[PDB]
Amino acid sequence: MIRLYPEQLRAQLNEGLRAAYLLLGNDPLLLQESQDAVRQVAAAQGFEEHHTFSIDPNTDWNAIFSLCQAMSLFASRQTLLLLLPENGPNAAINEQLLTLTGLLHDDLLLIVRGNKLSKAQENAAWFTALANRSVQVTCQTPEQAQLPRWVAARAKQLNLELDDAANQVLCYCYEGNLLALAQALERLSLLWPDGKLTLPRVEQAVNDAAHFTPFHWVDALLMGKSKRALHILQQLRLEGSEPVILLRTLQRELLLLVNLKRQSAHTPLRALFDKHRVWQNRRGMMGEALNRLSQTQLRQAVQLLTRTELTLKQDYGQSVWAELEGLSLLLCHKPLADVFIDG
Amino acid sequence: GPHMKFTVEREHLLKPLQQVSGPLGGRPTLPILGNLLLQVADGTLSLTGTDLEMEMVARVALVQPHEPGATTVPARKFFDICRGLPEGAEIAVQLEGERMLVRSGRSRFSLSTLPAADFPNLDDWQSEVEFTLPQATMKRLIEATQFSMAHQDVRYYLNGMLFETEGEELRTVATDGHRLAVCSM
Amino acid sequence: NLDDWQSEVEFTLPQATMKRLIEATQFSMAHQDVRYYLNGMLFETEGEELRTVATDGHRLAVCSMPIGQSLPSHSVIVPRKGVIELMRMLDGGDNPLRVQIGSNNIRAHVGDFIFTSKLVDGRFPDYRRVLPKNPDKHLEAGCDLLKQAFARAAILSNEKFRGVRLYVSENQLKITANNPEQEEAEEILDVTYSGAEMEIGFNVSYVLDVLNALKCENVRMMLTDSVSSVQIEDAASQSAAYVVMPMRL
Amino acid sequence: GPHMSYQVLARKWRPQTFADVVGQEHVLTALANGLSLGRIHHAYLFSGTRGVGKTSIARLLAKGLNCETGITATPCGVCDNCREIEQGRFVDLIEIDAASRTKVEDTRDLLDNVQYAPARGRFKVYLIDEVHMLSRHSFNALLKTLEEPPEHVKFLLATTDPQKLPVTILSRCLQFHLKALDVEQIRHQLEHILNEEHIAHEPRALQLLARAAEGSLRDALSLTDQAIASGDGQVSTQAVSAMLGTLDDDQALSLVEAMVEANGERVMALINEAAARGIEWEALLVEMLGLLHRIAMVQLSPAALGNDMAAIELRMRELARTIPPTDIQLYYQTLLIGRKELPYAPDRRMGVEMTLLRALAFHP
Amino acid sequence: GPHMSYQVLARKWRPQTFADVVGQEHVLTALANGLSLGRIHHAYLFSGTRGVGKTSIARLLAKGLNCETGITATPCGVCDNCREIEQGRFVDLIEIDAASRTKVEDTRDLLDNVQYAPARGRFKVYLIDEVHMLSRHSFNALLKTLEEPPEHVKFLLATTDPQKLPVTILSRCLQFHLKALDVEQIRHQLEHILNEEHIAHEPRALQLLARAAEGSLRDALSLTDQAIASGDGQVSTQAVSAMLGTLDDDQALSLVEAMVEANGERVMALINEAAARGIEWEALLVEMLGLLHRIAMVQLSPAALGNDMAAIELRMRELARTIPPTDIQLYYQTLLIGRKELPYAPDRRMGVEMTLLRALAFHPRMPLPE
RNA sequence: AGUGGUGUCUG
DNA sequence: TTTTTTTCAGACACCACTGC
Ligand SMILES: Nc1ncnc2c1ncn2[C@@H]1O[C@H](COP(=O)(O)OP(=O)(O)O)[C@@H](O)[C@H]1O
Ligand SMILES: Nc1ncnc2c1ncn2[C@@H]1O[C@H](COP(=O)(O)OP(=O)(O)O)[C@@H](O)[C@H]1O
Ligand code: BEF
Ligand code: BEF
Ligand SMILES: [Mg+2]
Ligand SMILES: [Mg+2]
Ligand SMILES: [Zn+2]
Ligand SMILES: [Zn+2]
Secondary structure (H helix, E strand, C coil): CEEECCCCHHHHHHHCCCCEEEEECCCHHHHHHHHHHHHHHHHHCCCCECCCCECCCCCCHHHHHHHHHCCCCCCCCEEEEEECCCCCCCCCCHHHHHHHHHCCCCCEEEEEEECCCCCCCCCCCHHHHHHCCEEEEECCCCCCCCHHHHHHHHHHHCCCEECHHHHHHHHHHCCCCHHHHHHHHHHHHHHCCCCEECHHHHHHCCCCCCCCCHHHHHHHHHHCCHHHHHHHHHHHHHHCCCHHHHHHHHHHHHHHHHHHHHHCCCCCHHHHHHHHCCCHHHHHHHHHHHCCCCCCHHHHHHHHHHHHHHHHHHCCCCCCHHHHHHHHHHCCCCCCCHHHHHC | CCCCCEEECCCCCHHHHHHHHCCECECCCCCCCCEEEEEEECCEEEEEEECCCCEEEEEEECCCCCCCCEEEEEHHHHHHHHHHCCCCCCEEEEEECCEEEEEECCEEEEEECEECCCCCCCCCCCCCCCCCCCHHHHHHHHHCCHHHCCCCCCCCCCCCCEEEEECCEEEEEEECCCCEEEEEC | CCCCCCCCEEEEECHHHHHHHHHCCHHHCCCCCCCHHHCEEEEEEEEEEEEEEEECCCEEEEEEEEEEEEEEEEEEEEEHHHHHHHHHHCCCCCCCEEEEECCCEEEEEECCEEEEEECCCCCCCCCCCCCCCCCCEEEEEEHHHHHHHHHHHHHCCCCCCCEEEEEEECCEEEEEEECCCCCEEEEEECCEECCCCEEEEEEHHHHHHHHHHCCCCEEEEEECCCCCCEEEEECCCCCEEEEECCECC | CCCCCCCCHHHHCCCCCHHHCCCCHHHHHHHHHHHHHCCCCCEEEEECCCCCCHHHHHHHHHHHHHCCCCCCCCCCCCCHHHHHCCCCCCCCCEEEECCCCCCHHHHHHHHHHCCCCCCCCCCEEEEEECHHHCCHHHHHHHHHHHHCCCCCEEEEEECCCHHHCCHHHHHHECCEECCCCCHHHHHHHHHHHHHHCCCEECHHHHHHHHHHHCCCHHHHHHHHHHHHHCCCCEECHHHHHHHHHHHCCCHHHHHHHHHHCCCHHHHHHHHHHHHHCCCCHHHHHHHHHHHHHHHHHHHHCHHHCCHHHHHHHHHHHHHHHHCCHHHHHHHHHHHHHHHHCCCCCCCHHHHHHHHHHHHHHHCC | CCCCCCCCHHHHCCCCCCCCCCCCHHHHHHHHHHHHHCCCCCEEEEEECCCCCHHHHHHHHHHHHHCCCCCCCCCCCCCHHHHHHHHCCCCCCEEEEHHHCCCHHHHHHHHHHHHCCCCCCCCEEEEEECHHHCCHHHHHHHHHHHHCCCCCEEEEEEECCHHHCCHHHHHHCEEEEECCCCHHHHHHHHHHHHHHCCCCECHHHHHHHHHHCCCCHHHHHHHHHHHHHHCCCCECHHHHHHHHCCCCHHHHHHHHHHHHCCCHHHHHHHHHHHHHCCCCHHHHHHHHHHHHHHHHHHHHCHHHCCHHHHHHHHHHHHHHHHCCHHHHHHHHHHHHHHHHHHHHCCCHHHHHHHHHHHHHHCCCCCCCCC
């Protein structure tokens, strides 16, 4: 199939419409805008009737097959849509997706929306049979190092003037929150029809919504950015994240750091990285962290992490978020006191 | 006075209440839309049941002394009382304060009511088609198309049935996106 | 399979007889009560009579029917599930019913098939003491006449605890109900009676079930005072008695 | 004020025009611009904090939508339809307590009311308060209606915890986030309310009430009515302060402040207060431990203060900047030891008192 | 002795007017002022510890609202409405055991019937007791009717922990916090009750009962009933001291002194004497620990001592002035560790004995000879 | 109403 | 490239499908 970013989708849609469109990724906003563009282009070429379905173990597949095979009294040119579940094309769903891949026709246009597909796990069969004459659209959230240029492009295409300061403020409050970021730009356009956004204008009309995953917290710890890591920790506290997930995500990299710092006396860090199968972008930040106050924080932090783990897993009142703040501050070149470490 | 003096037999009241109950009985959007509206006017009882979209009214003749009052009373309780009382029992309901007294030969009930001023009424509207029709023709017109109607379709207009008045004929149309049923008489 | 070679009691009983016997007592059982001995029906055998007793500590129901065959006095508690499913399978009154009760399990041969159940270990209470021993007030009424009045009163009854106050005066009965909404229902009925004015507040569902169990035309109620129980039965027989212990509200 | 003062300040004082709303200027300005320019989204989700006006803003927006003068940011005065929203009932404006009617059936009835024409107003406006409580199926039905809503239907959703709303609902709703009111805004609105109620008020009592409100204007209004109750139709500073102290539960922070300052009489007075309130003592020790731990983390890095403690920011700063880490370490160790030995004490009260006595006796 | 006087002080002495309350004055004053001025808020919450008059004051308010006369802060007794409320089973005072109506369907059933007019009184006063038991959905369901209910419906909430309520509701309803009761109020209430019950009582008995009530008057009334049952319908120092299982402060202070003044033989003698009286050994350790903490508190400030133990006040002062705080801390820690290790001691008697012996051996100013 | 499932939150 | 969570016990809340 044609693998495509949202940038050229319009162009591809102007070239022609394929049998099936697969909108995949973890970003609600990018998927939604891609689906809207696809539906508008389809309606331009006569696809008037729409449908929606949620791919679920309790869905009625017979209705989908009936509407795909049969035609309607009006608006014969029809389109169909399916929301894939959180996990993806379950093993009980691949066969019926294959049937749909057989039950299609040039009259119908299929839209597939859901999270990213683990291609290493799921491939061929359904995937290749669509790949015959289909389009894959990858709509994933831009990361922190990439978000500012995305926001600049969005401001340019919405006819706004964003300076670097407003851009970084917007990139600060809204991460993993591209939907609310676009809504914030829309609200700022509504607030001032001038279209010129400065620092105070965006600063006043913005909330610290954000959305982080424990990987962001662990990366912030490895870079040793105190404010960034603490902001991430507060955000996962407010979001309601399970602290034990944070514990495991930090523990994996912390034990890797302990192993690397212990073995670095006999082997350069490059061969250790190769031994443990760690990737290059990970390699850079882990090399930055390994020579940043090591051999003391790597056992003191393991001690504090064990304290948090046992306290979390014995009682039911939790109250481990402050201890996680202690960890966030220990691994960022801000030494703590033995009083809180030992307990 | 407050007593909406009311007196009727059961034989002439069971069927009208059964018709007026309609959609009442379940949880209503507003707490008053579970109470039948009872009105007395010009020697006639009006029973009213409203769903904020449907309005069923029944008229019962009064051949006994009466008083022009109106109030809303829980539908299920009033109906259960009405059918519970014996055959040929002359129901006599009056009112006082916020409670109405139901009475039959050697039996009394007291029911809590709400004012008639609060009960919704569908606003009067001007009519363009005044149409009169025999019963069986309407029966066949509905029955010949009711099957083809939509089943909770996302398209609102697919749900329901189309009535067309053209010249000397009336037409019922039904569609679900794949079927069409037309009956013109 | 059948290791219960010896049985405590044996019955060759008509299906309709036990159908009435259970139907006249089933509604008074206890469902998942903490008193495990009350979560069942007591079959009691004495002389030629078999009795079903069911109580939950708020109402007692006893029903006795002759068999003709002399049997030793015995008591057994059949749990709720066993008796309910035996009642369900008890159809086709043409075929007789065989009953085989041992010390630990019960068997019922219905038609051609066999039913098996276990017993409740506890010992059922004595129902003779629950029955009032000095009924000084006796009143009579019509079963359907009384029942319809109770139903009309129950229409405007407290939905949580369906309770009515019954007043008895000379040849007159009064049933008054109210709900948390103060909606008052009052029914007055003509009875035959001789005694003193007395008020007693008791549940409505229990009395209505008692009246429905007695598919008769004349009903006799026996009362002692405002605090003790009421023994309801029919005036055409003494084979079925019911004890409704009132509320103190 | 009203015909006998039973009418609550919270409900009697509710905005009827956009100008009467206290400074939630963001949403008001954006909505006014959208209404005046004609740019209308299908749904307008409102959110923020309790008692900051989201239901008030939604009601005023419904009034502006269905007013017969047209889509205006300023609903007029008489405009019988535009009046029916406040006094009486409006036919086309459906107000649903989505907390009372979470079921998919209760919302099914109204979503089937969607396709019927509005009676009087232009738009079949829906005001669904506490929208986060609709079940999964109610949310599915609401989303299905939000995919293709007719031009005569708008949805107004208000909630306090939007995180429970599905992303599918949030993508179709232009969420307007309301920020917790400042102490100045709350104090000014309370001042205006009391001045128009002909209620004698002292200036300091208003600031005390605003600080005690925790950013919610309705909290300030309820505390104000209660303060008038504690007295005879006058909001006196002494009465308000006594009432606030009676309602006060911030015992651990005051205990740490007085123990670090080495103020034995104040510490014992605060322990007496915590005893009279029937406050758990182990909970008191845990709160003090958490406060000391947070003070230390702030001393390490100013970013350790999240948005969960915006009420007690300044004091924390004051304690973190002025107290050396050695003293905080010693006090944390002392309180940890005391909480360890709390069960084996004459009673919890004496155990807590003795732990605080040790911490004072350290004098480091 | 007497007749079937089963009616216990706990319930028979439930206050019936605002003049019969033992001094929740921050609550009573506000209720009286609001009811006089008419600022009757549609919903508010009495929150406090156990047995301090939340339910009782709620009932008194219902009486004040529903009296036949004009709305008054002082309910009457000749009025039929207040008589029904006091006797219970009132038409309009709908007590809601919230721990039995936690579900949201129960709350919805409650809210459907809200708009119905009150039957006989002027308010349909919903009295939701133990509100903290309502589920989250029940609370959110109550939210809208708590904002503005019908003009006749008042919500009276009562709970022990107001922090388990969602803070939206804490905004909707007024908050009155009923604090625990000082020893003097509890003892005066017990005095008054036993005067009205024709039961002879002694001073020290009532002082000990009020001390052991722990600031709540319902515990005091249950303890008083238990003491009356322990005696022959008479309250005396012996009966209350045997019931509470404590010691007179003189014996405990004598043992503490024998520990401090290194009189180990006196320690042994008083231990044997306490063994004779059949008093729990852990009780002995707890009483010595309490006395040591009181000495430490006196060392902090003279105002530490309460009047209840005034009999030993002088000695307290002396032992506070003789012993510097470090020795008091050492003794308290030694006895605390002894009590903590008492369950694992071979015998409780010899556990306390070895705790005392350790406190005597580690004595800084007079250690046991080596 | 009985039964079974999903899911979320409290210790 | 992906990489993310202990537990036993209990309390609600909503939504089939049944059964009248
Ligand atoms: N912006 C505001 N302006 C004026 N009053 C407000 C404002 N926000 C809250 N209030 C007060 O709080 C009361 C309840 O407000 P409401 O808007 O229902 O809060 P919520 O956002 O939690 O639904 C209102 O009656 C009003 O007195
Ligand atoms: N303020 C008080 N004045 C007099 N007696 C009280 C007071 N508070 C509690 N009591 C005693 O406690 C008993 C029960 O009190 P109650 O009001 O139920 O406390 P609660 O707030 O826990 O429900 C009363 O019968 C009374 O004897
Ligand atoms: F009405 Be709010 F959300 F407290
Ligand atoms: F209502 Be109390 F806590 F006994
Ligand atoms: Mg609200
Ligand atoms: Mg109470
Ligand atoms: Zn207007
Ligand atoms: Zn009175």
